[PDB]
Amino acid sequence: AAKVKLTLEQAKLPDSQIRSAGFQDLLVQEQTKVQTAQTRRIDQEILSAGF
């Protein structure tokens, strides 16, 4: 029965919690980082052209 409770808790919390949190965080951070990288590339190109 103790082992059963181990299984119950591990199934309930870890899988779904990690899925939701990791998916949302990774997607948002990846989109923001891609946009920031594009903006930095544009700014570096502008500075190089001015130079």
| Residues at the interface with a copy of itself (CB under 8 A) | 2-48, 50-51
38, two tokens: 């594009």
Long-range CB contacts (within 8 A, 24+) of 28-32: none
Helix or strand holding residue 35 (H, E): helix 16-50
Least distance in Å: CB of 7 to a copy of itself? 4
